[PDB]
Amino acid sequence: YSYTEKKRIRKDFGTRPQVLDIPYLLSIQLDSFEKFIEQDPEGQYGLEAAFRSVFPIQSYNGNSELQYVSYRLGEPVFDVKECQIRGVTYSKPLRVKLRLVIFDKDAPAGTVKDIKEQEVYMGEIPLMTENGTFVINGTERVIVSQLHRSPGVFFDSDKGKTHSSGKVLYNARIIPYRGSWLDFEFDPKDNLYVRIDRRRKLPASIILRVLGKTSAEILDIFFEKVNFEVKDQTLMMELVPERLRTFDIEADGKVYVEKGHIRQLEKDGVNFIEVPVEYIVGKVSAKDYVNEATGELIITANQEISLEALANLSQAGYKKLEVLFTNDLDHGPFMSETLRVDSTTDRISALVEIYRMMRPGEPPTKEAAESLFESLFFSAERYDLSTVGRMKFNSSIGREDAEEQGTLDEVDIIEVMKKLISIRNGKGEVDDIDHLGNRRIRSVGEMAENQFRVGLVRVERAVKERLSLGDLDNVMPQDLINAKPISAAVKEFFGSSQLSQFMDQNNPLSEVTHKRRISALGPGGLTRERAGFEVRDVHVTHYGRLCPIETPEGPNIGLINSLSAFARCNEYGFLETPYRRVVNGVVTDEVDYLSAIEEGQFVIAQANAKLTEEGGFADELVTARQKGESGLHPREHVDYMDVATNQVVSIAASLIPFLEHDDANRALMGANMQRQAVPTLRSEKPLVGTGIERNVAVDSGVTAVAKRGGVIQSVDASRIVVKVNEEELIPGEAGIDIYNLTKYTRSNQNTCINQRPCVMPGEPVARGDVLADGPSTDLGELALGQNMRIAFMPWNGYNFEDSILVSERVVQDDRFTTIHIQELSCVARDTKLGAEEITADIPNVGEAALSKLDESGIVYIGAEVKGGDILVGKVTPKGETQLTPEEKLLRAIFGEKASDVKDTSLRVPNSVAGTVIDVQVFTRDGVEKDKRALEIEQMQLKEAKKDLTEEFQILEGGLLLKADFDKKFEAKRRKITQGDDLAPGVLKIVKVYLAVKRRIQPGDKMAGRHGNKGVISKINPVEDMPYDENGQPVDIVLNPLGVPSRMNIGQILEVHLGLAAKGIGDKINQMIKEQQELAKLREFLQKVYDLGDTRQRVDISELSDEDVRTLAHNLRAGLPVATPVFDGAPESSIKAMLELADLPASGQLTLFDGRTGDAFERPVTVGYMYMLKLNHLVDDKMHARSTGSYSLVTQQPLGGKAQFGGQRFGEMEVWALEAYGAAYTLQEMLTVKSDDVNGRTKMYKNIVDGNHAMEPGMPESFNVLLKEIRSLGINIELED
Amino acid sequence: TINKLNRISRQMLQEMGREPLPEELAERMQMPEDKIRKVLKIAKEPISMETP
Amino acid sequence: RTTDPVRMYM
RNA sequence: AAUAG
């Protein structure tokens, strides 16, 4: 046990040993970006691949070319924290070495006249952080992986649902990574048609003719030949034995049945058959037959032989005739009938027809047609069947060559045609479109490489255009390359792509789940409305690869998936999952990662299979799965086993205790809502857990993990200094490690990110130990919510539907109080009238509102502010304003007139009260820094001095020097002092950060981990809540009616186990309080940890006295227990745990009504549930408006709480009002509340006068409609 | 003036590897920095009202 | 056969 | 696009 785990050991109720630990959860991001940016000597991945794909750039004439040498990434201007503060992208400069080689015209082509080698700046590449995130414009973002259709060839059918009859129509689609699409389809007349890029169909034979295939060659490729001879004045079939098995058969020695088995007579073996001429009459010729004497073609290819034709060849002396084999079951004339409907007879005609279908309305020339056909599929510039696409193509058509080819050829097209014809005949099957072997994962590295190659092509066009000019004596490579297109491409992808998403940052689990998210949408994917049922379904290949539970509930159902716990992407982008080998009947601890294609062959047992001490299966027939179908299989036929019991579910589903007792519809909700939990003031571990909490806490990156072991030299709320062990020093190293903690930093969802130390000075630490706990972490365990005392009973209708009744104590102990940090900005710009000024001289505002402001007009740090309070004072110059005559008279009476400037200041939003915790001032380079900005600059300089001095002192104390530290401090000073690159016209920016403490209140959303969500209805007094015989009231009362119809029984089991765990914790607390002997404490702890037949062997004898005391202290608030998914605690274990803690075995206590003192007539299930506070707070959702801003064109109220907008009275509301008959209410809604400009002012004045009458007019939207219809040249008018 | 500012900014971006600040562009253009800022903000096309 | 004025002009 | 009903 590690020290952090030794501090609080969680009891494990699992029974199956784990042979494979859960791998790093953020590998799918880090590995992809490493592939992108790392240098590849083989040049197959990333920037090197893109550069070698575009370069060398060759001029059209041949004068010169630009060649690629190498690339490197420079040093970032700012770090991640500095980029987030300033609002800039964290990135590295791309520097590429290129040589412009200029050839000699007089010399033969290829003579190196000159070379010019130089480094070129080719843009700025955004960098991935240590946790798999990007910082774009100061915002943390995650690029989501895509599940797309693999490149290659796919054979499909319409399933007999297009034509009037069944007639199942078959098609084959070739889809590349880049380039046009190729389609081969059957019509209901059994003819083969070709489509290029989804346009008008053409007969398939055309594509063969453009490839130089004669009609006879086509027939030879697509048909077998039955031959005929004239032997001794008799007709001659060449017999193929397999075909025969309506006429009299030859071979008089072995006569077969005549006009009425085959194998017995074929056993002897003859090569001679005699047949009627009528057998020839129906056949179709296979060759073109010419006569030298006549000079004409007696019979053409693909022509039906006739009697006169037979006579003509008889006179011509030809004795052998071959025709095509054609049947109705195994062989078909489809290619012959296609040739019949084909009007093309030569390569040029086919090229011309392809040009007409490509580019209609253009005069076809031979050269243009040839160039078009070459560019469509056989040009590497415009076609790319990628390596994955090539491998899938070759596997489909059974080709074992051209592994590195990226373009189609004759063999590929002909093999696709043959396979489609074969599928029509009956040999072969169509492809499963939703099979995970046909769907590929495309991650950040691939998409970045694609966009970077796009930028490279953009600049390559201009480079070729310039090199074609010729005047290159004074041209250097950096004068040829414009990096702005490449930068535009990369910023487009990283900031405006659909898959570049604003990071989910409510809790660590939200971040981990977001980084492990796979979308079917995005560029090159599906669309929400156009996606069908089949793609949204759970395929049998999702086992161990995609979680069947975690998926968004809504229009996105089935299109967004979560990676499973052990899922991985192979080198080709296909998901694979680990399995344990079964060798010689024993289950080996060797692991093989199998993909969907490889999985189908084998018989794979489940992790629940019983095992013997020798490693083999106990039962003779085991439950396994093969080809996606489950069943019972012999023990000797099992080839693989599942590595873990949580292999099929994702991390969020793996965090749900007793998941096997929950219906999947509710497990979906539980997994989704675990990601919306808001961290609280005090993180509390779950009493009932699954064991994956530590993994999420460590792999999220929110915690501070010891890079090296040692002894904690110094601990503080903001800094941890570790004295490293003597065995783990880099020779000549200071010997200390410094961990600076994040303290009250805003997250993407305006929550609080705070790191709290969990170590003491002098405490030994090993590698991987948790030194500080991030948000929603407790001693290295994920702590999303709080443990609540729960009673399942109705309480006077306050838990009606899904309502939740909460005790006042829960509010008093601040158990669900949350900190929300909000950022506000005041931007002083430059206007035509003048420059906006930030100052405390605010007109028409007294000294009451200026108390919290300083001389510079900015609020003090630590100022408690309420709604409407001024944070930053700002005055905007205003123009001359016309005064009404009454205002002129009022000014004449009282002469005051001070209206030079207008108060446009930053104020706290209404219903927001908090504390100012940070103020930042950004000033444009060349604008005077006010007193406050100078104060912040001095404070930052002093803090940098102090931090550098302390760090230097500790590192020199560990070691036991001026130029290097002076350089570091000079760099820090330059970063602090310099001006800020702000948006044009912006003179100054002041950002104020407000910390708001939000307490639980009616309207807040609370949930468990089983889909049991609800809204708080009442905050009950403690004396009114149900209580037990010992006087302890419950904390939350939940409705028992929500359990049976929703089939989430894991919540009841969790309640029972939580009651047991809290009882055992109370027993431990009692033993500590009475100061019993440590031997008794050890005996009790060992009894607790030995309960059940579990896989955990915790020996308290190996723990020191201080360790036992620490463990007992950490078990005071309840014993944490682990119940893994599908390997959980049985009911017998729960009852034994209840009996140990001296609690009823049924989990039901006798409760009394606090209002009356009377016992409830039945026992009530009382226990402890882990409850969460979701980020759906009534503070952010309560809106109201009477009158406000209006739209510019429609003159209707704006929309949104941010704009103080109004609710939309849609069509269905109008229908409801019409059904009621409320004509006057409807007219109010249409006219005087939305867009009757005169009517709404009159209505406001009437209400102020207390008259309550309206004078409706014409809505402005109708006037707009009239104007647009008139603008369409249509006279629309109103008649009286 | 706008086009030649763009050309000079592209050459300086190639030269130093980072975006040219307005004072450096002003020095290379032999024009005041205020004129550079004027040219900079008057060289932006109107945004569409249909932009999401 | 075509609607693009560019192609008609060419 | 994502999220809630």
Distance CA A840, CA A859 (A): 10
Return the DSSP state at A1147: S
**C1 contacts on A by Cβ (under 8 Å):** 360-361
Encoded tokens for A831: 């206007």
Contact at 8 Å (CB) between A797 and A1045? no
Q: Which bases of chain D come closer than 7 Å to a protein CB?
A: 1-5
Encoded tokens for A322: 């071959």
- Bridge partners (DSSP) of residue A792 are A1038, A1165
Distance CA A425, CA A442 (A): 36
Number of Cβ within 10 Å of residue A1100's Cβ equals 19
Nearest CA in chain A to B11: A479
- Bridge partners (DSSP) of residue A184 are A172, A194
Distance CA A1132, CA A15 (A): 14
At A1264, give phi and psi (nearest 5°): -60, -45
Distance CA A1217, CA A446 (A): 54
Q: Strand A704-705 relative to strand A770-773: parallel, antiparallel, unpaired?
A: antiparallel
Q: What is the DSSP string of A1069-1129?
A: HHHHHTT--HHHHHHHHHHHHT-SS-S----GGGS-HHHHHHHHHHTTT---EE--TTS--
**Chains touching B, CB cut-off 8 Å, 3+ pairs:** A
Contact A93 B10 (CB under 8 A): no
- Bridge partners (DSSP) of residue A147 are A441
Contact at 8 Å (CB) between A948 and A968? yes
Number of Cβ within 10 Å of residue A182's Cβ equals 22
Contact A361 C10 (CB under 8 A): no
Chain A nearest CA to C10, separation (Å): 9
How many helices (H) does chain C have, and how many strands (E)?
A: 1, 0
Contact B18 A93 (CB under 8 A): yes
Chain A nearest CA to C4, separation (Å): 9
Which run of H or of E encompasses A712?
A: strand A710-715
Q: What is the DSSP string of A134-199?
A: EEETTEEEEEPEEEEEPSEEEEEE-TT-SSSS----EEEEEE-SBS--EEEEE-TTS-EEEEESS-
Contact at 8 Å (CB) between A422 and A7? no
Which are the residues after which chain A is interrupted (C to N > 2.5 Å)?
245, 260, 960
Indicate if CB(A673) is under 7 A from strand D. Answer: yes
Number of Cβ within 10 Å of residue A187's Cβ equals 15
- Bridge partners (DSSP) of residue A752 are A746
Pick from A283, A287, A284: which is nearest to A214 by CA?
A287
CA angle, residues A305, A307, A309, in degrees to nearest 5: 55
**B17 contacts on A by Cβ (under 8 Å):** 74, 93, 95, 121
Q: Does the CA dihedral A930-A933-A939-A943 come out positive or negative?
A: negative
- Cα atoms in the 13 Å half-sphere on the side-chain side of A570: 19
Q: Which of A352, A358, A359 to mutate to test the interface with C (most CBs of C within 10 A)?
A: A359
Q: What is the DSSP string of chain B?
A: -HHHHHHHHHHHHHHHSSPPPHHHHHHHHTS-HHHHHHHHHTT-PPPPTT--
Contact A361 C8 (CB under 8 A): yes
Instruction: List Cβ neighbours of A478 (8 Å cut-off, separation of 6 or more).
Output: A118, A119, A120, A121, B14, B15
Contact status of A481 with chain B (Cβ, < 8 Å): yes
| Residues of chain A (543-562) having a beta carbon less than 7 angstroms from strand D | 552-554, 556, 559-560
Distance CA A414, CA A250 (A): 38
Distance CA A1037, CA A1160 (A): 14
Encoded tokens for A309: 């034709």
Distance CA A597, CA A574 (A): 10
A1027-1050 in b/e form (b: 16+ CB < 10 A) is bbeeeebbbbbbbeebbeebebbb
Q: What is the DSSP string of A296-360?
A: SEEE-TT-B--HHHHHHHHHHT---EEEE---SSS---HHHHHHHT----SHHHHHHHHHHHHST
Contact A360 C10 (CB under 8 A): no
Q: How far is CA A404 from CA A179, A386, A390, in A?
A: 17, 9, 8
CB pairs under 8 A between A and B: 27
Distance CA A520, CA A22 (A): 26
Indicate if CB(A672) is under 7 A from strand D. Answer: yes
Contact at 8 Å (CB) between A741 and A757? yes
C1'-nearest nucleotide to the CA of A504:
D2
Indicate if CB(A251) is under 7 A from strand D. Answer: no
Contact at 8 Å (CB) between A459 and A485? yes
Q: Which residue has the tokens 């740090």?
A: A861
Q: What is the resolution of this structure in A?
A: 2.6
Return the DSSP state at A478: G
C1'-nearest nucleotide to the CA of A1174:
D4
**B10 contacts on A by Cβ (under 8 Å):** 482, 484
Distance CA A785, CA A27 (A): 27
Distance CA A637, CA A838 (A): 81
Number of Cβ within 10 Å of residue A1023's Cβ equals 10
Distance CA A263, CA A895 (A): 124
A264-271 CB contacts, 8 Å cutoff, 24+ apart: A266/A241, A269/A241, A270/A239, A271/A238, A271/A239
**Chains touching A, CB cut-off 8 Å, 3+ pairs:** B, C
Chain A nearest CA to C8, separation (Å): 8
Number of Cβ within 10 Å of residue A63's Cβ equals 18
Distance CA A718, CA A753 (A): 13
Q: Does the CA dihedral B31-B37-B41-B44 come out positive or negative?
A: positive
Contact B14 A484 (CB under 8 A): no
Q: How far is CA A565 from CA A147, A476, A545, A635, in A?
A: 17, 53, 8, 27
**How big, in percent rounded to 5, are the helix, strand and coil portions of chain C?**
50, 0, 50
Return the DSSP state at A650: -
Distance CA A1261, CA A1258 (A): 9
Q: What is the DSSP string of A881-935?
A: ----HHHHHHHHHS-----SEEE--EEPPTT--EEEEEEEEEEBTTS---HHHHH
Chain A nearest CA to B52, separation (Å): 11
Q: Does the CA dihedral A118-A122-A124-A128 come out positive or negative?
A: negative
Q: Does the CA dihedral A105-A110-A116-A120 come out positive or negative?
A: positive
Q: Strand A818-829 relative to strand A710-715: parallel, antiparallel, unpaired?
A: unpaired
Which run of H or of E encompasses A626?
A: strand A621-626
Let me know if chains C and B touch, i.e. at least 3 Cβ pairs under 8 angstroms.
no
- What angle separates helix A931-959 from helix A962-977, to the nearest 10 degrees? 160
Chain A nearest CA to B4, separation (Å): 15
Rg (CA), chain B: 13
Distance CA A506, CA A189 (A): 60
Pick from A734, A746, A693, A687: which is nearest to A710 by CA?
A734
Q: How far is CA A642 from CA A226, A264, A600, A1188, in A?
A: 55, 52, 14, 62
Contact at 8 Å (CB) between A120 and A138? no
Number of Cβ within 10 Å of residue A722's Cβ equals 25
Q: Which residue has the tokens 């380039």?
A: A179
- What angle separates helix A347-358 from helix A366-377, to the nearest 10 degrees? 70
Contact A93 B40 (CB under 8 A): no
**Chains touching C, CB cut-off 8 Å, 3+ pairs:** A
Contact A362 C4 (CB under 8 A): no
Contact at 8 Å (CB) between A1005 and A1180? no
Contact at 8 Å (CB) between A593 and A580? no
| Residues of chain A (1154-1213) having a beta carbon less than 7 angstroms from strand D | 1176
A153-165 in b/e form (b: 16+ CB < 10 A) is bbbbbeeeeeeee
Number of Cβ within 10 Å of residue B49's Cβ equals 7
Indicate if CB(A570) is under 7 A from strand D. Answer: no
Number of Cβ within 10 Å of residue A384's Cβ equals 19
Contact at 8 Å (CB) between A552 and A560? yes
Q: How far is CA A852 from CA A626, A869, A902, A991, in A?
A: 73, 9, 21, 16
- Bridge partners (DSSP) of residue A92 are A125
Verify cis geometry, omega within 30 degrees of 0, for the bond prior to A775: no
Number of Cβ within 10 Å of residue A329's Cβ equals 7
Protein residue minimizing CA–C1' distance to D5:
A554
Which are the residues after which chain B is interrupted (C to N > 2.5 Å)?
none
User: In a 3-state reduction of DSSP, which class is residue A1033?
Assistant: strand
How many helices (H) does chain A have, and how many strands (E)?
A: 35, 58
Return the DSSP state at A1065: H
Distance CA A1050, CA A659 (A): 6
**A359 contacts on C by Cβ (under 8 Å):** 7
Rg (CA), chain A: 40
Chain B nearest CA to A880, separation (Å): 26
Distance CA A1181, CA A1199 (A): 14
Max alpha carbon distance in chain A (Å)? 139
Ranges of beta strands (E only) in A431-489 are 439-442
C1'-nearest nucleotide to the CA of A522:
D1
How many residues are there in chain B?
Answer: 52
Protein residue minimizing CA–C1' distance to D1:
A498
How many residues are there in chain C?
Answer: 10
C1'-nearest nucleotide to the CA of A502:
D2
Q: Residue A991 CA to nucleotide D1 C1', Å?
A: 28
Contact A121 B40 (CB under 8 A): no
How many residues are there in chain A?
Answer: 1280
- Bridge partners (DSSP) of residue A439 are A149
- Bridge partners (DSSP) of residue A93 are A124
Nearest CA in chain B to A478: B14
User: In a 3-state reduction of DSSP, which class is residue A385?
Assistant: coil
Chain C nearest CA to A356, separation (Å): 10
Contact status of A498 with chain B (Cβ, < 8 Å): no
Pick from A480, A486, A452, A487: which is nearest to A464 by CA?
A480
Distance CA A389, CA A377 (A): 14
C1'-nearest nucleotide to the CA of A514:
D2
Distance CA A48, CA A30 (A): 18
Q: Residue A1052 CA to nucleotide D1 C1', Å?
A: 38
Instruction: List Cβ neighbours of A701 (8 Å cut-off, separation of 6 or more).
Output: A130, A131, A511, A774
Contact A925 B40 (CB under 8 A): no
Chain C interface, Cβ < 8 Å to A: 1-4, 7-8, 10
User: In a 3-state reduction of DSSP, which class is residue A970?
Assistant: helix
Distance CA A526, CA A148 (A): 8
Q: Which of B7, B11, B14, B38 to mutate to test the interface with A (most CBs of A within 10 A)?
A: B14
Nearest CA in chain A to C1: A361
Distance CA A868, CA A912 (A): 9
CA angle, residues A267, A268, A272, in degrees to nearest 5: 110
C1'-nearest nucleotide to the CA of A560:
D2
Instruction: List Cβ neighbours of A333 (8 Å cut-off, separation of 6 or more).
Output: A190, A284, A324, A326
Chain C nearest CA to A460, separation (Å): 26
Identity of residue A1134: I
Distance CA A515, CA A141 (A): 10
Contact at 8 Å (CB) between A466 and A459? no
Number of Cβ within 10 Å of residue A887's Cβ equals 12
User: In a 3-state reduction of DSSP, which class is residue A457?
Assistant: helix
**A361 contacts on C by Cβ (under 8 Å):** 1-4, 7-8
CA angle, residues A962, A966, A971, in degrees to nearest 5: 155
Name the residue among A481, A981, A984 with its Cβ closest to that of B37.
A984
Distance CA A861, CA A810 (A): 31
Count Cβ atoms within 10 A of the Cβ of residue A200 and give its class: 0-12 exposed, 13-18 middle, 19 or more buried.
exposed
- What angle separates helix B33-41 from helix B22-29, to the nearest 10 degrees? 110
Contact at 8 Å (CB) between A562 and A518? yes
Q: Does the CA dihedral A366-A368-A369-A373 come out positive or negative?
A: positive
Identity of residue A859: V
